[PDB]
Amino acid sequence: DEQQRKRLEAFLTQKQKVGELKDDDFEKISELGAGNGGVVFKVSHKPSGLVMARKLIHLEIKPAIRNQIIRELQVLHECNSPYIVGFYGAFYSDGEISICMEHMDGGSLDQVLKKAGRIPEQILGKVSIAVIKGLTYLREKHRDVKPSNILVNSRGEIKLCDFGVSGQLIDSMANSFVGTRSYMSPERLQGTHYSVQSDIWSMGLSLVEMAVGRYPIPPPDAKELELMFPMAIFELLDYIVNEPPPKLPSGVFSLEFQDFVNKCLIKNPAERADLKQLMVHAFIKRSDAEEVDFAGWLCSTIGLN
Ligand SMILES: *[C@H]1CC(=O)[C@@H](O)[C@@H](O)C/C=C/c2cc(NC)cc(O)c2C(=O)O[C@@H](C)[C@@H]1C
Ligand SMILES: [Mg+2]
């Protein structure tokens, strides 16, 4: 796409001007989406004038380990796609790794979900297209999919944010903190290990969460649906592994959307749909030919002006 080629080359143009990144070059503007493994700040890169998002991972380790993490992250400089958050750079300074990224003014979809209550079907169609393309980019040029990892902006863009190219980095945060496992596929929880197929599962679950406005397991056996229209993490993960997958309620959502998530959420990974299959699924082909005002919906919902 041409508007997409123009924005990708504008990004790189701006990025070519920045040069090597250093702590003392950054001014704090605010804190964003803080929590998780590290805090995140909106920052100004004073020399260039660029606003950026900076993730800080407090870690105390050997100069070797950190020099390795920094080099493994350089990998992200070649990942240029409209569906992946722009990466400016990564460095270490005074006990903490920094990862600097394009500032997505819409934030992440967990935040948008909190504010909107639930995300409409037609918007989730756009989200689905972006995630599928994003995931198709990562496979064709070589993950953890959940609402907090999908960022959005006022230009209508939807992108994945991920720093798990390193691994060793993840290696060394385990003793410090560990990201939630409540989006992992039953076959990762049973140890079989990743395939792109486990990210389809996660995409499916995230979409149901955003549709209904709540983490969907366990099902809302209640009038909560009627209202709509406790489990410890270990009870939950058994539940994922042993019980049937969640689904959308009926009536409220189109059958095509129901079917799309059902196919992402099939427990057996061999039977669960693949990306080639999702790309041509009817929900997707229909969503692709709707012209949905995502920016307009987004700006209204979170109060961007
Ligand atoms: C993205 C992934 C990440 O670590 C997630 O935990 C995010 O939910 C944290 C949110 C980051 C964020 C938030 C805003 N809000 C206005 C804007 C952004 O551009 C980012 C962002 O780019 O996060 C990057 C730094 C991480 C690595
Ligand atoms: Mg300093």
Q: Which helix (H) or strand (E) holds 171?
A: helix 168-173
Residues with Cβ–ion distance below 5 A, ligand 2: 23-24
In Å, how far from its chain's centre is CA 216?
18
Per the CB < 8 A criterion, the answer to whether 258 and 119 are in contact is no
Q: For residue 27, give its domain range.
A: 1-105
From 297, 116, 118, select the one nearest 206 (Cα to Cα).
118
Please report the resolution in angstroms.
Answer: 2.4
Of 290, 246, 269, nearest in space to 128 by CA: 290
Same domain, 15 and 149: no
Contacts of residue 208, defined as CB under 8 A and 6 or more positions apart, other chains included, come to: 216, 246, 247, 248, 261, 265
CA distance 113 to 248: 17
Q: Which pair of tokens denotes residue 120?
A: 């409409």
Q: Nearest Cα to 302, choosing from 115, 148, 150?
A: 115
| Inter-residue contact 81 to 45 (CB < 8 Å) | no
Q: Verify that 24 and 113 share a domain, yes or no.
A: no
* 84 and 132 co-located in one domain: no
| Domain boundary pick from 60, 78, 105 | 105
Which residues lie with the beta carbon below 6 Å from any ligand 1 atom?
32-33, 36, 40, 53, 55, 85, 99, 101-104, 107-108, 148-149, 151, 161, 163
Whether 125 contacts 285, CB under 8 Å = no
Whether 166 and 194 map to the same domain: the answer is: yes
For residue 144, indicate whether it is catalytic.
yes
- Could you give the C-alpha distances from 144 to 149, 157, 165, 180, in angstroms and in order? 8, 19, 11, 10
Tokens 């042993």, located at residue: 242
Strand partners, 150: 160
Catalytic residue among 144, 171, 259, 293, which?
A: 144
Ligand 1 atom showing the smallest separation from residue 107 Cα: 15
Last residue of a domain, one of 41, 73, 105: 105
Same domain, 133 and 246: yes
Neighbours of 125 (CB within 10 A): 23
The number of folded domains in the chain is 2
Same domain, 154 and 284: yes
| Distance from residue 29's CA to the centre of ligand 2 (Å) | 17
90 and 131 share a domain?
no
φ, ψ dihedrals at 161, nearest 5°: -115, 115
- Quick one: 196 and 235 in the same domain? yes
For residue 135, the Cα-to-chain-centroid distance in whole angstroms is: 10
Q: Do the Cβ atoms of 215 and 209 come closer than 8 Å?
A: yes
Is 34 part of any known ligand binding site?
Answer: yes
43-54: burial string, b at 16+ Cβ within 10 Å, e else: bbbeebebebbb
Domain closes at, from 84, 105, 126: 105
Query: In this structure, how many other beta carbons lie within 10 angstroms of the beta carbon of residue 107?
Result: 22
The crossing angle, in degrees rounded to 10, of helices 121-140 and 196-212 is 160
Q: Flag whether 163 is marked binding.
A: yes
Give the CATH number, domain containing residue 115.
Answer: 1.10.510.10
- 258 & 116 share domain: yes
| Expt. technique | X-ray
What the block records as the tokens of 215 is 């983490």
Which ligand gives the minimal distance to the CA of 147? 1
In terms of domains, do 182 and 78 share one?
Answer: no
Does 111 carry a binding-site annotation?
yes
Tell me the C-alpha distance between 279 and 28, whole Å.
40
Both 50 and 146 in a single domain?
Answer: no
Task: Look up residue 35 and give its DSSP letter.
Answer: B
Q: 90: closest CA among 81, 100, 82, 80? A: 100
Shared domain for 74 and 135, answered yes or no, is no
